[PDB]
Design a protein around this nucleic acid. Structure first.
Lengths: 97, 209
RNA sequence: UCCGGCUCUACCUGGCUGGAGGGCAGUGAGAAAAUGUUGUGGUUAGCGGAAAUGGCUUGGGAUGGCCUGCCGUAGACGGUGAGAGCCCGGUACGUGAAAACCCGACGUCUGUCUUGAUGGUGUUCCCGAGUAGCAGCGGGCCCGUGGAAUCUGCUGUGAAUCUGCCGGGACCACCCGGUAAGCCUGAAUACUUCCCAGUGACCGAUAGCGGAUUAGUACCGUGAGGGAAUGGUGAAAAGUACCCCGGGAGGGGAGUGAAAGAGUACCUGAAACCGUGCGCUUACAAUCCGUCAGAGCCCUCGACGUGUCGUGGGGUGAUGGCGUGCCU
RNA sequence: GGCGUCUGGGGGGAACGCGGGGAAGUGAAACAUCUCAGUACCCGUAGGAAGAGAAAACAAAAUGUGAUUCCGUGAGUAGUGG
């Protein structure tokens, strides 16, 4: 899906346009991902509830995978025909990311 | 008699064609051209529209209640038009829209159209759009920029010369054609028309005999 | 073509019964089974796949406008917080199958003609029998019993084999064509329960399949059988934490949110219908309920002057005249 | 006929096919012959397609055609018909 948990991303669209972020979880069945520090919502939880500021899911087509060189870059797929993997790869450099 | 200069992508001219007089000095008959394009569009149009009348719907084949004594009106099926769920009456049906325009009216249309463009100097010729056997749309686009500035344009390239087709296909305005299926709507919708020389020769020695 | 033996038999011939090189053909309708190679041949999962975090402004959000670049064998389509060729999914294009399945391809395997043919010459024999034909009732052929052939069904009767027989619209003679009553035969043709991919001058929740919602369900009927209704919050639930009235429902503040004239009875939110306020009018009057004249009061625009007529306009409208709903 | 063994068939299906049976309301301004229709429906059996199919055929003196089927025309004609 060109994003996995543990990757790092750059936000495009929203009030939080221009934000780095770490991916925490993804929801591939609906193309949405919960990035850290973005989409802050003041959820009410009643117990002893409280107005608490939590994350919410971006849609995955509002984030570019940050290049290993620290710039927003696309990603693509070579093959290491020996090992038979399909490595996710930037389309500026060609490196392993 | 109108003359055309072939044109090259590399920035030169090869030769000149001396177009016929009778194909390309016909006077247009606007009613004729109207009729024929209307026919083309009609035959394009497919008749996928059908509805279920009173005799194809579900049920209704029982007189729902008495004729008399009830108080209410008289009814013979629960699927008649005036009900809610009932049959369409005079509905659409799957039908054909083609109409049989003759060969002479058609060809008269096409010749008159090509004349309308020729007199106004919108028929350009060309040997090719490309260098050898490798499509590149940037080439054809630059060449049409050299040769033309209008929005829309027609291209007539034969079957074997697939590279020009594959090249110019993706452009916004262009609408490519083979001269064996040369028609009238596709001509008139345009502003300029780019023939290949093979195409002209085929067209002319196919019609003229 | 060579021979093995056979023509009852040893011997000359003619004719069989065997094997052999060979040829032909093959899963054919013309006999039939499996065999193993086998084609980037096809189907049954998929995969890569070009190019802008571009600049100013608006806005909650830019995918908009304007200005700058690029790709293009890819500007088809869709989605993404508002119309996205350059975000995403994917397209043009090229790739891909251990196994199974289908096409042929082969080599097996199987037969099969090979011991043979071209022509000569005068006469006997055979050429599909309860049938063809004829008569009686009937069907269907353009043809309704008509002069009515051909094709036929049931009964009854019932012939010949080539100078034979059946037809050429009654029938007869001549000529013509053809050789019944034994059998198989592909391709063109018709069709879609299901499956795959798309198109639409087709519908868009009283439409379209009866069924966008648990739908042949609920409900009805003993039973066969009939047979409905209900789509939309917003960009994401951030679905109102907390306080006050109340038993609770429900609500008011405080909040979220771009907007709560978006609150899980939620896009917009008409009319009928139900009411609350403000102005005029209405309790001595006979009203298809209106129209023409119009007093009086209230609102308004404008020229002026301490309030005031006007090439005015609008709501009500005392009172007078006229006036017998709409359709078929 | 009884006993044992071996192989088949048995039912479902949306249409399409072939053989058989087989109506009526309707039209005729009534109606029975006729028509509606050999339709609907029912039966028996199939196949991926079926059935038909190699002349006991056409034709008209033309020195002609050469299995069958399905499409276009001939033709709404020659004709048939209370």
């Amino acid at each position: 899906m060109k994003v996995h948990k543990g990757d790092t991303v750059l936000v495009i669209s929203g009030k939080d346009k221009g934000a780095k972020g770490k991916v925490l979880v993804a929801y591939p069945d609906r193309n949405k991902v919960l990035v850290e520090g973005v989409n802050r919502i003041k959820k009410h939880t009643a117990v002893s509830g409280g107005i608490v500021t939590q994350e919410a899911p971006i849609h995955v087509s509002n984030v570019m995978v940050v290049d290993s060189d620290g710039k927003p870059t696309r990603v693509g797929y070579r093959i290491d025909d020996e090992t038979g993997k399909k490595v996710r790869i930037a389309k500026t450099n060609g490196k392993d990311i | 008699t109108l003359k055309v200069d072939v044109k090259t992508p590399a920035g030169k001219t090869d030769g000149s064609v001396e177009l016929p007089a009778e194909l390309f000095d016909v006077e247009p008959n606007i009613a004729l051209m109207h009729q024929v394009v209307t026919a083309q569009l009609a035959a394009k149009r497919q008749g996928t529209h059908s509805t279920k009348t009173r005799g194809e719907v579900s049920g209704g084949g029982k007189k729902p209640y008495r004729q008399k004594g009830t108080g209410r009106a008289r009814q013979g099926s629960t699927r008649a038009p005036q009900f809610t769920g009932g049959g369409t009456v005079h509905g659409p049906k799957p039908r054909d829209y083609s109409q049989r325009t003759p060969k002479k009216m058609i060809a008269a249309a096409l010749r008159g159209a090509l004349s309308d463009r020729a007199r106004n100097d919108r028929i350009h010729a060309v040997t090719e759009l490309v260098e050898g056997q490798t499509p590149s749309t940037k080439s054809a686009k630059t060449f049409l920029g050299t040769l033309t500035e209008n929005k829309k344009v027609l291209v007539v390239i034969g079957r074997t010369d697939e590279v020009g087709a594959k090249s110019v296909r993706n452009l916004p305005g262009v609408h490519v054609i083979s001269p064996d299926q040369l028609n009238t709507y596709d001509v008139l919708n345009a502003d300029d028309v780019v023939f290949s020389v093979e195409a002209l020769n085929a067209y002319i020695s196919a019609n003229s005999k």
